[PDB]
């Protein structure tokens, strides 16, 4: 109504997004989040942007999850609005892991930033990538505060990272996957 609040167990919002080609569908094609979900296979959805350090710091660990589990689970990176958009002048005095991105003007800018991200962090095609639409519908529906992971299973939210200081933890996602595939 006036605000959204998603929780564990609820139906996963079928947000509108745009494909970002990640070759080994047409680049920029419109699609929906649940287009990437299949049978009882978990879909691990990782929301963030290049200027969000908690997100980029764990992108290598995300890549490893994709490598270890893509035969049994699907992976989707949803590129949202920049956490810390650049103004182009100030020089990060520390060498930083990720790269600067200015505030997106349009969908093309957001898709371009996702293309930059995929190259910088060596994400493989099995890590499917989309960009949120410019109305930020996926960001708002999934309650993302700069970065979040949601695992969708059987059309419902099976895992939803919390709001604590260290709630964004891809090794907790690893644990979920280990449990799901264990006897």
Residue numbers in the entry: 70 to 93, 103 to 261
Give the article text.
The three deiodinase isoforms are homodimers sharing highly conserved amino acid sequences, but they differ in their regioselectivities for the deiodination reaction and regulatory features. Dios feature homologous transmembrane regions and catalytic domains with a catalytic selenocysteine (Sec) residue essential for their unique reductive deiodination mechanism.
To explore the molecular basis of deiodinase isoform differences, we solved a crystal structure of the catalytic domain of Mus musculus Dio2 (mDio2cat; residues 71–262). Two lysine residues, Lys180-Lys181, were predicted as the best SER candidates based on sequence analyses with the SERp server and consistent with the structure of the homolog mDio3cat (likely surface position) and were thus mutated to Ala. The mDio2cat structure comprises 183 residues, covering an N-terminal Gly as a cloning artifact, a small part of the linker to the transmembrane region (71–76), and the complete catalytic core (77–261), except for the C-terminal Arg262 and residues 94–102, which are not defined by electron density. The basic Trx fold provides β-strands β1–4, and the sheet they form is extended by a single strand, βD, from the deiodinase-specific insertion that further comprises an α-helix αD and the extended loop-D (residues 161–188), which protrudes out of the globular structure. A major difference between Dio2 and other isoforms, however, is a 15-residue (91–105) “Dio2-insertion” in the N-terminal region of the catalytic core. Interestingly, there is no electron density for nine central residues of the Dio2-insertion (94–102), indicating conformational heterogeneity or high flexibility.
